[PDB]
Ligand binder design. Structure first.
Ligand code: S8D
Length: 152
């Protein structure tokens, strides 16, 4: 059948929202009120991959954009990028592995592990206005926990 998707927003566990902040870049900042319309709406697709009760493979597309979060080696390091695709072909159930995140539910929060790069996570910094990135530990000063808000 088709691939199933849900519209949503994400907030880090410090309650920073995510906004597109220039060509193919996502930043996290504290937002409330009118400025919250700026937050990124994701289309979260439920994709093919290894699955368990609390570990669900997803792709994170930007709503009504041919842009996906993806994990690739850059200058020899696992990194997070926004990657454009052929809009005729996406989303699909069998997403390429660089687009797949394991959405892990622990203690009423979510982590998004790279399926391609085990133990690398979608991360934010403590400081405001810094990039969303792929971070190689769910332990230390960087934030790897999120909450999801369902959007109409
Ligand atoms: C710099 C380009 N920014 C936008 O088009 C803003 N929108 C992007 C969309 C994925 O999430 C909702 C948000 C309102």
């Amino acid at each position: 059948a088709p691939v199933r998707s849900l519209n949503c927003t994400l907030r880090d566990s410090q309650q920073k929202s995510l906004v597109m902040s220039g060509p193919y870049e996502l930043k996290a900042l504290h937002l409330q009120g009118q400025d919250m319309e700026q937050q990124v709406v994701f289309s979260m697709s439920f994709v093919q991959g290894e699955e368990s009760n609390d570990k669900i493979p997803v792709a994170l597309g930007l709503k009504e954009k041919n842009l996906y979060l993806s994990c690739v080696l850059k200058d020899d390091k696992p990194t997070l990028q926004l990657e454009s695709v052929d809009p005729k072909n996406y989303p699909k159930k069998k997403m390429e592995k660089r687009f797949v995140f394991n959405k892990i539910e622990i203690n009423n929060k979510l982590e998004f592990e790279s399926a391609q790069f085990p133990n690398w996570y979608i991360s934010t910094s403590q400081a405001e206005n810094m990039p969303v990135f792929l971070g190689g530990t769910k332990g230390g000063q960087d934030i790897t926990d999120f909450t999801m808000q369902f959007v109409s």
